Amino acid sequence: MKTPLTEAVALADSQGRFLSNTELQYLYGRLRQGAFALEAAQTLTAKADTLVNGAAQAVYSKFPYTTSTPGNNFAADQRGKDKCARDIGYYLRMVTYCLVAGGTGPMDEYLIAGVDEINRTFDLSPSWYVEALKHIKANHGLTGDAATETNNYIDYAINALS
């Protein structure tokens, strides 16, 4: 729940003080981020289906063996392909929430808390979703402050993922 307004509130709660001017600057920074983050989330939501479709196909061409061998993590038949594409769509939707929230909190709470543990107990590999996010950050094709703020969120997910 990493939200700079709420993190400022949690800070001033821990201090027990009233609202300081540091928090006013914090609000200014949040507005400065949101003033392009909302439009970036808009075009991401426009592009999202082509993004997850190209990302799934690129990961399938990236490792041929997950299509090849019959296994439980891998997409041998079409149900595994559905679960795989559901997972990358989940990832990109977390990216959009992470962008629109102004912080890593939706990402943190909804993915980062136990991702490596379910990857351990299901024998998944995080590198699949790493190269998926690499294809997404190559595919969104944006420019400006919004593009690199989204790219920052994406490589944060990559770093915490690996």
Partner 1 sequence: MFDIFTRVVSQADARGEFISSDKLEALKKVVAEGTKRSDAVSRMTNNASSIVTNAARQLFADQPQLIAPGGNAYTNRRMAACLRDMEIILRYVTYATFTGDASVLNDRCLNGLRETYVALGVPGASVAAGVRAMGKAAVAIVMDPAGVTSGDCSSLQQEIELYFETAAKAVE
Partner 2 sequence: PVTVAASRLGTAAFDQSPVELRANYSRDDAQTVIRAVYRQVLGNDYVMSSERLTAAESLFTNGFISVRDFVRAVAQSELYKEKFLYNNFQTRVIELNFKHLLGRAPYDEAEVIEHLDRYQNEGFEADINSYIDSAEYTENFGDNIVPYIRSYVVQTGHRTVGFTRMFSLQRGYANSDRAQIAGNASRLAQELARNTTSAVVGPSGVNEGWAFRSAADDYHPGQSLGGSTGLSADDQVVRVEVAALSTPRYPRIRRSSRVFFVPVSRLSQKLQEIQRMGGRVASISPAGQ
Ligand X SMILES: CCC1=C(C)/C(=C/C2=NC(=C\c3[nH]c(/C=C4\NC(=O)[C@H](C)[C@H]4CC)c(C)c3CCC(=O)O)/C(CCC(=O)O)=C2C)NC1=O
Residues annotated within a binding site for (2R,3E)-phycocyanobilin? 84
Nearest to 154 by CA among 129, 141, 137: 137
Using CB under 6 A, which of the segments 2-10, 43-51, 65-73, 151-159 binds ligand X?
65-73
Q: Is 111 in the site for ligand X (CB under 6 A)?
A: yes
**Which tokens belong to 97?**
């929430």
Q: Is 121 in the site for partner 2 (CB under 8 A)?
A: no
Residue 43 binding partner per list partner 1, partner 2, ligand X, none, with a CB distance cut-off of 5 to 8 Å that depends on partner kind: none
Phi-psi label, residue 22: left if phi above 0, alpha if psi -120 to 50, beta otherwise: alpha
CB atoms closer than 10 angstroms to residue 159:
9
Burial label for 47, CB within 10 Å (0-12, 13-18, 19+), is middle
Number of residues that bind partner 2 (CB under 8 A): 7
Q: Is 10 in the site for partner 2 (CB under 8 A)?
A: yes
Q: Is 101 in the site for partner 1 (CB under 8 A)?
A: yes
Position among 55, 94, 133, 157 found at the interface with ligand X (CB under 6 A): 94
**Which tokens belong to 93?**
């939707």
Residue 14 binding partner per list ligand X, partner 2, partner 1, none, with a CB distance cut-off of 5 to 8 Å that depends on partner kind: partner 2
At which residue do the structure tokens 């289906």 appear? Answer: 49
Q: How far apart are CA 40 and CA 46, in angstroms?
A: 10
Residues in touch with partner 2 (CB under 8 A): 1, 10, 13-16, 109
